[PDB]
Write a protein that binds this DNA or RNA. Structure first.
Ligand SMILES: Nc1ncnc2c1ncn2[C@@H]1O[C@H](COP(=O)(O)OP(=O)(O)OP(=O)(O)O)[C@@H](O)[C@H]1O
Ligand SMILES: Nc1ncnc2c1ncn2[C@@H]1O[C@H](COP(=O)(O)OP(=O)(O)OP(=O)(O)O)[C@@H](O)[C@H]1O
Ligand SMILES: Nc1ncnc2c1ncn2[C@@H]1O[C@H](COP(=O)(O)OP(=O)(O)OP(=O)(O)O)[C@@H](O)[C@H]1O
Ligand SMILES: [Mg+2]
Ligand SMILES: [Mg+2]
Ligand SMILES: [Mg+2]
Ligand SMILES: [Mg+2]
Ligand SMILES: [Mg+2]
Ligand SMILES: [Mg+2]
Ligand SMILES: [Mg+2]
Ligand SMILES: [Mg+2]
Ligand SMILES: [Mg+2]
Ligand SMILES: [Mg+2]
Ligand SMILES: [Mg+2]
Ligand SMILES: [Mg+2]
Lengths: 320, 321, 321, 321, 320, 321
DNA sequence: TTTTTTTTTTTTTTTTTT
């Protein structure tokens, strides 16, 4: 819902412009934002903030709804194909839009490759598992490679010029810039239809920007704010949020029950903010193992997928 | 419960009840538990009218002393919602107790949301099998509600999927203020139809981000205290079980090395004191999960092993052992 | 890049830029990439001054969104440094990529230092033959730097040995703190002259002994992450290719016998994720060496054979086959 | 080198220098190379005092970037110790290089100890005949030191046997901790008189038995890395050749058939990467021995034949061919 | 020096008793023992172990020393005659005390006979190449024969009763028992002057106690510990350690340049641990050939010696 | 010897002694001689239990040092078994020594089996005439055992033929594994009755065919080493003479022509070092045989002439000269 | 009230044949 519909009941265009300058670009943005956030924006009075909230609640349903209606709505929710039938079956149709999907794993585990595949598939038509929308790739490690997008578009029949023109790239150099890029992301989606957000990787910049136990609380608070903004973006625009996470080896030997000594970065903030968490492990050569660690609906299962020159695909017989 | 419309006596008009409903008070119990200052804050109500309403609620809703034997007799017939697992029901002494706030805190994929879905389904099954015979009211703050789980658990328990879904009221809270405001609508709907369960998954998720830093910590704790005061008022009014999930944080300080678990529930003292029962959830092998009673006025501190399956929360299978 | 001497606008004085240079930020890209908190930690910089410095840096250096087509066009003209071996260049898709950290990990005598010397010589040859047309910057931690190799490779590639030696900046790191501090001097040198290569041979040699024990490991990896972040910042600012060598560790856990290679690179996940491209080096027969692309965002996992010669890294001859 | 007494400036008292010497740092280079946290571990030294010491050491000892031509002309005048055999000197490009750790690994009776004795004698002969004009420092861990060999080699080279013996500092290490602690006394002696050679025969012999099993393997290799770092620091400070002998173990896993040698040096990757130059020793016919340059940053992988004689290590004779 | 001298600076008799129960019977043993070895003894704390180390360093010189002083000390060192002038000339005066001498060779090559001769000669006066100390014979093959000692004592004029009473015999039945015997050896040497340790043979028990490729690493680790303990005993008491090693016929015929197809057991551990290694071969009749394979100071040379009823001696003219 | 039942002290029950009995350990001496690792691998035995068993065995069986005078006195009382020939007894210094492994290697039909039969008969005759007064245990592997020889020799020595026959324990080995397993039954039998001789004719006949090729040579010799170790354990435990026969192999390699005898026994160094005494057997004129002491710790290398007769092994007569 | 982290590290022979 466009934010311009709020220009009613004494709400002027200046108020909408000020809200847009503060990172709120849709009616859902005003509806989800708390009253204190509106008050923190300069030039907004308490009464006019209250009337903005009332108008947003009238435009965007904030009340209760039967679970049957929510199930029917989620049945129409778009799922983005990952390019692998095994992975789509594991995810119950692919990457779910409107929810944060976390891909945590060690290096060469295909997280960036899967993100590139998702970035290409977000543009293919809906009938083949696409999203029919532009991608928005947030890169924090410098590991984005448009050659991969060109190859995957060749696999999926997309025009390489059209495929590259429909992928939004911004390189994040620090945690503050990474969070600030979400305002530009919201502004871009308020003008054109997007279908996917990728932040590869979320925790790369937070690792170095905040160092030591003294800044750990600030680091996790900033990460919580960042995924709060990501979840709000997913709610407003219905876009799939795919985030990659680095891992660290658990140096404590007390929990020897766990055969995997590596855990994702971000701690409980990352753990609880992500709707779906996928653990990636190395297979034999191109083989990669994906394990659903956390998911409200998907059972904890493991599937095998492979990385090829044309993107993420199902393992081949010769590779078995 | 006693409907608020019964207060229209001794000169109390319909407009007063309308204003009370607009102020979030939908039952006579709500008026009885509401302090006089809260009634005075409502426009159109004078001091004499406020005290008259208080006296009417007092003579309609008992507020005096009762013998411990009478309270024990009343609690004996209190409904306990089955959790779908015999081990968990034994740990809780019959399941989730209605009329009290039950807190489920633990690490991720520990089954808090799955247990909440199982409780949402079982609140509709007949009382003879540990049900509640009432609608569920699910408040989701993390966007993790999945009606497919409700359908699967209803198939497990024999409930019709359409009936199960139509009897579960779902609302997603996007901020702390909206999370608190949803309770007024919850009370309004409960004043019209019988409910049997309140779920807030999760309470702390929106507060961790809406209030940031030490400066806003006091405001966050005050808002959380208000939210749990409203939840406790709802539980007292409607006798509905309140199940709340809580995320965890890793305690950086290593001073309390005597505790093998470096994870503690979020919310601090307000969270600890507001919850009648707190259950700590840990991951076992495979689908198995460990539930531990951390705080309870009557349940001893003990641990039980339960598992999460496609049909919902249940006891671990022999093949999983 | 954008020189830092363009920041004296909108009330920003030259003295503020002087403190910025003293803090290790020598380019407008450097202050653009540095977070607000890092600017605030510099003495003599206020909140408003740091904010306006950030705004000016963002105006000068594009930090906003850009279409992937533009990024592909920009990367098409990106300079790739030839390694002196056609097989290795084909494996790397043109050679060592500038602006990204390339990691060469392997056991001893596998040619990591030899390949770094070859890259240090080839970074000065003209662009038409795979060069960089820029001075090299060699950071050595094991004391294994040998200018005789540079002279031999320069005679191989036609460079004047005196000019080749004069165009290589060498500094030996004696401790991890000194190794990190050397990057400030590297940035200062690059802010006044064009540099086309960074070599850190080796990154983890000094952290291995500076930090000892499991308890000291966290500080070691935090310092390593800071060092790699600084290297990535240098590569982003100056478009300079960063080539880092890493030693190996034998994996004592024999349960995971599925992997035939018992040697893994040092640094753990910090070095693993910080490096854009990782190349695994193994010894062949005699001069032959095997290079394997363990990790790369765009290069497929493939293995090639290259040899170490008196004149540097080159393709194996049929006589050695 | 720069004596540590030059640090008595800018408020640094004699007590600070005494504590530094007691902590094992006996030169200004030792203070410069040591990290800040290493200085913090010394009692009686504050953080500000450590920063001042680091600044003064960096002012006295150059630590910044230097052009490769300057480093090349500095290494041109570097002293190489003759091994008594022209074949071995040609293989090593002039002899054993000072300021770098040279490793002599091989099977028994292959001449490692004999070559170390020859180097110990030649380090005292004048420079023009390939000497070092400095005292030797022999650290023996197997009890195989034999002054009779030194006397014979001195008679071969014309040195006075009494003078040759008086110029060799002998210390036997009985445990790994004592082996590491001997380096502090070595540095203390070196800061007082000009030395030109350090011999540790052998480095790993004490580590074989001091640490047993895979449980202590990590601690064993960490201690070995600390010992080798300390040796590298000593070489950097005093500009002396560090010659270390290493035992070998026959590799059981014969999976790789490309290596005709079933014996590999002990110490793993720690010793493989710590040693600047590695020489593999094998027995030839009679007194003849085979030396192979396994690892070297500047020397090609080649083999030469040398022999062990009663007067020391020398080239094989025509009668022995 | 006796370990009782460590009872200073607050070190009690209980500490010395615990050290003696742990196999450390001399202050030299405490000095040579590492920090972790001292920490493994119950009843000894961090500060207590450190204080013991400083006291031992004060008593036992552990610092540097000029090579001239060590040369003088080795010049005044005692060398045990082997009863054969040729063998003594080959060894440069006889078996060197304080160093491990390894006698490896085929069967009936004279290793056990030479050990018996050394056991007898360790008691004869110094002026005739003796040691004036008791022998310590550790037998692992059951090949010890006191009749040989009696005959050699008759050759050298010693009283057979005195000769037998001055030889400490203990038969090792397993590798663990063989290693444990060294603690009793140290205890006996701490109270009486010994001059020779014989282990015949070192590798006989290790061959069968550890079997298969999997147990080879543990076998060689235990062997390294045993040889380290032998070297510690030699350093502490200044006694000659004469050990016999059996031989195995190497099957790799590619290295045909070596005319000898038999190599000693123990591999590199025995190769490096032994200060001096002597290869024994049979000559004409009673004559035997001894070859110095490894020695830090003796040239690689061969001499011919013979075995007679009265012990090891030079070959006779009648046997030539 | 000390029976294993005496270990039933300090918490050692019947179960432990039994589990030892099926583990091949039937005496306290067997427990003492067995290493700790061998005790640990036995099922039902804990580390503390194994340590307690070791301490109890050490208390019962003296494992400490002892003066050579005491050893000589004990060996003076050691039993020697007469071979029926004065020449052979004089060559062996009284006959076959008990408690030691005596090897009889020679050409076919040189009397090894006949001498073993004679020893089997003489081990039962009274001690005053060189006997052993104990049962014999014959392990025949070539199938050449003939009880008629035992009957004839018993007639020669005056023993009752039935008493001689039923006092000889026979067990025929069909493969190497069965040959090794038979020693456990031998120990079990000897723990029940007094034995005085063990005969294995022949040791390496079965190993020659069971293991073939270079690959199985290592396993063959390792199994042979285990077998002879067990034989030595039996000899130490029961004080019995172990007499083993071995075939011969002609040395095809004629380069070592210095040895007039081209035949050497099978088993190589394992049999060479495991056998306490080795006797070389050659065929003389007629029925006379030549016996030569090849290896013996105390017997000088000498030869004697003995002959084989119907009544057994005896000295040659004048008519045979 | 708060709020995670983060890898190490080799080893070690063997064993006759006809
Ligand atoms: N063009 C390609 N063709 C085939 N396989 C490729 C190609 N590019 C990359 N790969 C594969 O993908 C791997 C790289 O994985 P990816 O780029 O997804 O990183 P990641 O696992 O997320 O790790 P990081 O933490 O380092 O970013 C390579 O090692 C290779 O196996
Ligand atoms: N349909 C299903 N069938 C079986 N198991 C499931 C299913 N859906 C989820 N699970 C299991 O439950 C886990 C998710 O638990 P749940 O959704 O209750 O989260 P939670 O512990 O409350 O955490 P969060 O804080 O992320 O909401 C999954 O990881 C999986 O193990
Ligand atoms: N009393 C003796 N008189 C003369 N010579 C003897 C005497 N005892 C033994 N010999 C000689 O010594 C040889 C035995 O050698 P020795 O006992 O030293 O064995 P070894 O070579 O160490 O072998 P191993 O321990 O492997 O059996 C006999 O073969 C013989 O030549
Ligand atoms: Mg990636
Ligand atoms: Mg979740
Ligand atoms: Mg949840
Ligand atoms: Mg190198
Ligand atoms: Mg990568
Ligand atoms: Mg040596
Ligand atoms: Mg090297
Ligand atoms: Mg012998
Ligand atoms: Mg040696
Ligand atoms: Mg026959
Ligand atoms: Mg026979
Ligand atoms: Mg023998």
């Amino acid at each position: 819902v466009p934010i311009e519909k709020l220009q009613v009941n004494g709400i002027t265009m200046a108020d909408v412009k000020k809200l847009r300058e503060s990172g709120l670009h849709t009616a859902e943005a005003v509806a989800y934002a708390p009253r204190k956030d509106l008050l923190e924006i300069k030039g907004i009075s308490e009464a006019k903030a209250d009337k903005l909230l009332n108008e947003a609640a009238r435009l965007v349903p904030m009340g209760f709804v039967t679970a049957a209606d929510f199930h029917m709505r989620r049945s129409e929710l778009i799922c983005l194909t990952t390019g692998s039938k095994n992975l789509d079956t594991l995810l119950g149709g692919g990457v779910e839009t409107g929810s944060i999907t976390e891909l945590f794993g060690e290096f060469r585990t295909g997280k960036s490759q899967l993100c590139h595949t998702l970035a290409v598939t977000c543009q293919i038509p809906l009938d083949i598992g696409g999203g029919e929308g532009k991608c928005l790739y947030i890169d924090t490690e410098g590991t984005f490679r448009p050659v991969r997008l060109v190859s995957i578009a060749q696999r999926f029949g997309l025009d390489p010029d059209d495929a590259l023109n429909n992928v939004a790239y911004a390189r994040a150099y620090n945690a503050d810039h990474q969070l600030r890029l979400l305002d530009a992301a919201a502004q871009m989606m308020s003008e054109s239809r997007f279908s996917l957000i990728v932040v590869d990787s979320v925790m790369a910049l937070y690792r170095t920007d905040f160092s030591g136990r003294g800044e750990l609380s600030a680091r996790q608070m900033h990460l919580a704010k960042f995924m709060r903004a990501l979840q709000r973006l997913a709610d407003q625009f219905g876009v799939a949020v795919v985030v990659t996470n680095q891992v660290v080896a658990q140096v404590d030997g007390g929990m020897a029950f766990n055969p995997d000594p590596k855990k994702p970065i971000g701690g409980n903030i990352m753990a609880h903010s992500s709707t779906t968490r996928l653990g990636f492990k190395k297979g034999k050569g191109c083989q990669r193992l994906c394990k659903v660690v956390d998911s409200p609906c998907l059972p904890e299962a493991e599937c095998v997928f492979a990385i090829y020159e044309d993107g993420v695909g199902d393992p081949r017989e010769e590779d078995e």
